[PDB]
Design a protein around this ligand. Structure first.
Ligand SMILES: Nc1nc2c(ncn2[C@@H]2O[C@H](COP(=O)(O)OP(=O)(O)OP(=O)(O)O)C[C@H]2O)c(=O)[nH]1
Ligand SMILES: Nc1nc2c(ncn2[C@@H]2O[C@H](COP(=O)(O)OP(=O)(O)OP(=O)(O)O)C[C@H]2O)c(=O)[nH]1
Ligand SMILES: [Mg+2]
Ligand SMILES: [Mg+2]
Ligand code: NA
Length: 367
């Protein structure tokens, strides 16, 4: 009969969960500003390296002179051996390769939650907002993997040198600048593309494969198609599931993309009503454990691994994730049946953290 309704608690843009999660325009503009700085520097580093290559096209300069030239650019912020390597790579280029490099101008495209608007304000101390800004290198389906990575690293490392409180982190799939004071990091995955999703190649930092075909547009188009198909509330509930994950784990938990994929599957196959996103979240929560136990398939069919493994592959971390997923619909049910508004709030905040504090967003209802 009587039940607490949480639709405002979730959706209210003043001080409900959407209000707590969505970045303000100032914050978004700050991120855009950070993105521009990184893009400009990467553009500049490539122009600088191209200037050296241009000089070598004109005259077959000695190795020591090429090295000296490298030392005057932003590449000076790489290690000595890495500078030697860039100089050696420029020295060793054949005419064809050098011409291709002289024709290369990096392009950029943001992928991930800043692009499709699911980027949440961070919650726990230590957690950071993420901007995924890819750099793209148009090439014949002729510039080498090593040189390209060194130049993008030169870019990021040169900014890290100039800015107090910025730090560089090498990842398998990107370079990363972390800005702890701003609770932000920017990831720069690097792609080779033709000068056709099959030809978008993501550079890998280590291993048996230098490249793998992984077009971020596949996920972006899948998600935006899903939003059109299911409704705008898809973005809201994905934000909320990510907020749940940030509240349950300081570090770790299921990936954002696994939560998106499982949520889309559920909302495509189970009736729900966007006029009550509290019920919609309860419905999602009821079905997530089965989605995750069987393994969460990627929306990109070319991915070699699922986004979350099936339960026969579970270790302590996946077991912990299954446990918290199993608890979530119980938390939501108990909040619905709580004795008072204040207890309803206390209970639902055990799912999403103590972010929403306004118990007037919770209203007595019937269901
Ligand atoms: N095909 C594929 N793409 C991935 C995978 N992981 C990340 N990506 C691509 O990178 C994009 C950004 O990934 P994330 O930073 O992990 O997710 P997000 O949507 O930005 O969420 P968050 O706000 O937590 O950063 C999404 C997708 O295009 C994956 O496992 N497979
Ligand atoms: N296109 C693509 N980008 C990925 C993939 N995995 C990670 N990325 C990009 O690298 C960034 C760092 O990845 P993680 O480390 O796994 O976090 C996130 C995203 O921008 C992937 O499978 N495909
Ligand atoms: Mg991201
Ligand atoms: Mg990232
Ligand atoms: Na939980």
């Amino acid at each position: 009969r009587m039940t607490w309704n949480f639709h405002q608690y979730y959706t209210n843009r003043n001080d409900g969960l959407m209000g707590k999660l969505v970045l303000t325009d100032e914050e978004k503009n700050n991120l855009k500003a950070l993105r521009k700085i990184i893009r400009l520097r990467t553009r500049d580093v490539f122009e600088e390296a191209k200037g050296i290559a241009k000089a070598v096209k004109k005259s077959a300069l000695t190795f020591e002179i090429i090295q000296e030239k490298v030392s005057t650019t932003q590449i000076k912020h790489l290690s000595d051996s890495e500078q030697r390597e860039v100089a050696k790579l420029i020295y060793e280029m054949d005419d064809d390769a050098r011409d291709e490099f002289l024709g290369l101008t990096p392009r950029f495209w943001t992928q991930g939650s800043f692009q499709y608007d699911t980027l949440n304000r961070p919650f726990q101390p230590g957690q950071e907002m993420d901007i995924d800004d890819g750099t793209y290198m148009p090439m014949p389906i002729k510039i080498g993997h090593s040189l390209l990575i060194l130049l993008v690293d030169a870019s990021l490392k040169s900014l890290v040198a100039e800015n107090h409180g910025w730090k560089f982190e090498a990842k398998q799939t990107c370079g990363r600048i972390k800005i702890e004071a701003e609770k932000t990091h920017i990831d720069v995955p690097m792609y080779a593309i033709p000068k056709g999703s099959e030809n978008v190649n993501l550079a890998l930092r280590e291993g048996d494969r230098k490249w793998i075909n992984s077009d971020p547009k596949i996920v972006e188009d899948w998600f935006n198609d899903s939003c059109i198909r299911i409704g705008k509330h898809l973005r809201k509930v994905c934000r909320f599931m990510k907020a749940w994950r940030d509240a349950q784990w300081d570090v770790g938990g299921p990936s954002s993309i696994s939560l998106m994929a499982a949520t889309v599957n559920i909302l495509d196959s189970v009736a729900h009503d966007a006029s009550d996103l509290g019920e919609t979240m309860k419905i999602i929560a009821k079905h997530l454990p089965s989605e995750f136990a069987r393994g969460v398939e990627s929306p990109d069919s070319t991915d070699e691994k699922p986004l979350f493994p099936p339960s026969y592959k579970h270790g302590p971390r996946e077991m912990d994730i299954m446990s918290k997923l199993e608890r979530l619909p119980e938390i939501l049910s108990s909040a619905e049946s709580a004795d008072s508004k204040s207890e309803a709030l206390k209970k639902i905040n055990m799912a999403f953290g103590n972010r929403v504090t306004n118990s007037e967003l919770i209203v007595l209802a019937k269901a």
